[PDB]
């Protein structure tokens, strides 16, 4: 990508947000990988929308890219798992354990066993390391604080955490100039943006 194209994505991001296309904004952020939206990330973590969180993240890093992005996913899947235990859905808890958490077993053998053994507890807070866990809403908040730090420290997010700042509707402003350049000369000043004004 050029820096022109990269900059153009940002203008588009601003435009889409102003026109209130909310889901398109975050799909664009994700697929371009140019801007990571913390506010959005927090909102999704609090709502516990775990599939969307991992999907949004996936535009910026994969699970095994580095030790930072590896702990990010681990933390998310650990909370997913604990919530499953907490509503006593042991069917879901085991599924998460095998599908989502097993990748971390390869290099953390003992930890994977320790996490597995929480299945046999009446309450996982019987484990002293998890004894400090207070409710879903609070646990999510606590975890979110940890994630924000991990992302801000992640070298793959390094140039991605700050939106530029622009006068509103910069894209519309540029478009207007093109009409000035086109719709000048030959025709001034409803017709399209599809072809040049003459």
């Amino acid at each position: 990508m050029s820096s022109l194209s990269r900059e153009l994505v940002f203008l588009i991001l601003q435009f889409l947000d102003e026109e209130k296309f909310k889901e398109t904004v975050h799909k664009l952020e994700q697929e371009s990988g140019f801007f990571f939206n913390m506010k959005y990330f927090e909102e999704k973590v609090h709502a516990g929308e775990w599939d969307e969180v991992e999907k949004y993240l996936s535009g910026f890093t994969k699970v095994d890219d580095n030790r930072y992005s590896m702990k990010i996913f681990f933390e998310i899947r650990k909370q997913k798992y604990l919530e499953a235990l907490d509503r006593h859905d042991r069917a879901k808890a085991v599924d998460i354990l095998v599908k989502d958490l097993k990748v971390f077993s390869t290099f953390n053998e003992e930890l994977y066993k320790e996490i597995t053994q929480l299945l046999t507890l009446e309450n996982f807070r019987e484990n002293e390391q998890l004894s400090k866990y207070g409710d879903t809403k609070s646990a999510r908040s606590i975890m979110l604080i940890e994630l924000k730090k991990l992302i801000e420290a992640n070298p793959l997010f390094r140039e991605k955490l700050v939106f530029p700042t622009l006068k509103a509707s910069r894209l519309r402003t540029l478009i207007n100039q093109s009409l000035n350049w086109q719709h000048q000369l030959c025709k001034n000043p409803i017709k399209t943006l599809f072809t040049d004004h003459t």
Binding site: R67, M70, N108, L111, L130
Partner: peptide, 7 residues
Amino acid sequence: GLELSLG
């Protein structure tokens, strides 16, 4: 400490 843990 970037090691994964329960805590």
